[PDB]
Design an enzyme around this catalytic site. Structure first.
Site, PDB file in Angstrom:
ATOM      1  N   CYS A  90       3.712   5.665   2.840  1.00 15.78           N
ATOM      2  CA  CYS A  90       5.203   6.243   2.621  1.00 15.78           C
ATOM      3  C   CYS A  90       5.281   7.045   1.396  1.00 15.78           C
ATOM      4  O   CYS A  90       6.121   7.638   1.096  1.00 15.78           O
ATOM      5  CB  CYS A  90       6.356   5.097   2.877  1.00 15.78           C
ATOM      6  N   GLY A  91       4.015   6.922   0.544  1.00 20.10           N
ATOM      7  CA  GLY A  91       4.109   7.620  -0.690  1.00 20.10           C
ATOM      8  C   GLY A  91       4.735   6.773  -1.515  1.00 20.10           C
ATOM      9  O   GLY A  91       4.490   5.574  -1.851  1.00 20.10           O
TER      10      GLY A  91
END
Lengths: 285, 234
Positions: A90-91
């Site tokens: 998801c970063g």
């Protein structure tokens, strides 16, 4: 760097780029359907929003502002809800929400309020288990389109804890979907403190057949559950959007690395040809 | 230098770009009609190199503290000239183009730099432990370099992430202003004794300075200067 290891590296990063582009495409479709689910849940949420505004407009006395509507004094225990992705990639979204939760815990402990954790999603669960906090309520394996029945196991527990005096206040930390690209963690209050909205101003007089107090005690828990469901769906949409952006960045980085590795491979190829022809010429002479 | 070595005087010997010695040997050999070895180099590369370098020795009568410089064709470290130099040394230092391009101007690659006296009996146990840890951490970062490059920093574990951040801080911290390089970096030169270097890197590895942004480790002396800069920045 022998014009054959670099070729293998180039093949590897090309595979990375293809996989990452596929992940970006599926995450785009996921975001589409999650946004559709959020918009389909919106009518229940806003209808109940103005219903609650109208109800708390009538219930203005402190004596009848009891159960979930009471604004407790001398807050002692606080519960915070965290919704996190079940999977990575998801970063910075998971890191951002967990940083917000950790700092919020820091201020809540600064004022002397003991804090208890209630987590959705495996990332928050694992992080809070590792850092020390036992999950008071744990819920994982929530799909991209979770049903409200799946959140009851945590929401009912939190509401019962608030009713029994265990928690003097309630919060939720979720990833707000500001844009397709920009998402920040957000904090929301779960003790109602409802808004004197136009509905609250609306003076339409009502009739409460089971009773005003009974309707209040039966609707406040459902309003809180609706808020939590809205937050969870918002977080799912933000999860898919953040994964989209992370995979787009990863695909671009993989393409850049393929370009650099191709330059290195071409340099190695030219060097190898030069070396072999020089050796052959030396041997001929 | 050998006359002064033989009579007992301690000699400091600075030879610049031994590589041009080898290159001149290669040109002379090409003109001499010898058959070229490897990349156009003289067949008598090892012998000439040994004839030059075995005279650079500290003997019983006196000592020579040689400190050479070597030019690698472009950035090639497998070239025959540096390849023959590497075995003729006690302490090796490698300067990387990539590190210099990042303005970490001392530019020594800790992983490609070694020394014979990096042994706890000689240099000290704490010095050896700190250096070996600063190489282990540096290695972890080189292994995770591609993972950070394409995917990002967030996919690493918490401890891998911490070691990567500490590795970047260590990279920035090897930078040091020099008295002779004051023209390039306006900062004055800093003479950091080895004991202060060991203390600074031990503190950096211990966890102290984790809160400090990596930008404050650039062109500083010991860890105390970094702490002072951070405090002045609040």
């Amino acid at each position: 760097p022998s014009s054959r290891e670099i070729k293998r590296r180039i093949r590897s990063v090309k595979n990375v780029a293809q996989i990452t582009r596929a992940m970006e495409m599926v995450s785009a479709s996921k975001m589409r359907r999650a946004q559709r689910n959020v918009l389909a849940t919106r009518p229940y949420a806003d209808r109940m929003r103005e219903v609650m505004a109208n109800l708390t407009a009538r219930v203005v006395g402190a004596a009848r502002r009891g159960t979930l509507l009471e604004k407790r004094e001398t807050v002692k225990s606080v519960a915070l809800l965290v919704v996190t992705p079940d999977r990575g990639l998801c970063g910075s979204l998971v890191a951002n929400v967990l940083r917000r939760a950790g700092r919020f815990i820091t201020e809540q402990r600064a004022m002397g309020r003991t804090v208890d954790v209630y987590t959705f999603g495996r990332k928050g669960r694992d992080f809070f288990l590792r850092t020390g906090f036992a999950p008071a309520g744990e819920a994982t394996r929530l799909g991209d389109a979770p049903k409200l029945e799946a959140i009851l196991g945590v929401a009912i527990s939190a509401i019962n804890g608030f009713q029994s005096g265990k928690y003097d206040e309630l919060y939720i930390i979720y990833s707000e979907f500001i844009n397709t690209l920009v998402q920040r963690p957000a904090i929301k209050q779960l003790l109602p403190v409802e808004s004197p909205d136009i509905s609250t101003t609306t003076n339409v007089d009502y009739t409460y057949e089971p009773g005003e107090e009974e309707v209040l005690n039966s609707i406040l828990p459902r309003y809180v559950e609706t808020q939590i469901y809205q937050a969870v769906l918002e977080s799912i949409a933000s999860e898919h959007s953040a994964r989209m952006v992370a995979m787009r960045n990863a695909t671009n980085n993989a393409k850049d690395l393929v370009r650099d590795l191709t330059l290195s491979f071409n340099k190695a190829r030219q060097a190898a040809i030069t070396k072999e022809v020089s050796e052959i010429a030396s041997g001929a002479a | 230098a050998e006359y002064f070595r033989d009579e007992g005087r301690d000699i400091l010997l600075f030879i610049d770009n031994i590589f041009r010695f080898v290159q001149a040997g290669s040109e002379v050999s090409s003109l001499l009609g010898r058959m070229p070895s490897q990349v156009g180099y003289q067949p008598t590369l090892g012998t000439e190199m040994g004839e030059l370098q075995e005279r650079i020795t500290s003997t019983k009568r006196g000592s020579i503290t040689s400190m050479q410089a070597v030019y690698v064709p472009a950035d090639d470290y497998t070239d025959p000239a540096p390849a023959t130099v590497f075995s003729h040394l006690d302490a090796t230092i490698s300067l990387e183009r990539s590190i210099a391009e990042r303005a970490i101007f001392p530019a020594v690659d800790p992983l490609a730099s070694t020394s014979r006296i990096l042994d706890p009996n000689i240099v000290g146990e704490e010095h050896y432990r700190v250096a070996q840890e600063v190489k282990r951490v540096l290695q972890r970062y080189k292994d995770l370099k591609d993972i950070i490059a394409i995917l990002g920093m967030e996919e690493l574990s918490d401890e891998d992430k911490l070691t990567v951040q500490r590795a970047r801080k260590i990279e920035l911290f090897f930078s040091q202003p020099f008295t002779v390089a004051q023209q390039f970096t306006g900062r004055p030169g800093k003479y950091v004794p080895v004991k202060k270097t060991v203390e600074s890197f031990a503190r950096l590895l211990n966890g102290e300075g984790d809160h400090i942004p990596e930008s404050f480790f650039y062109m500083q002396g010991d860890f105390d200067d970094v702490l002072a800069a951070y405090e002045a920045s609040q």
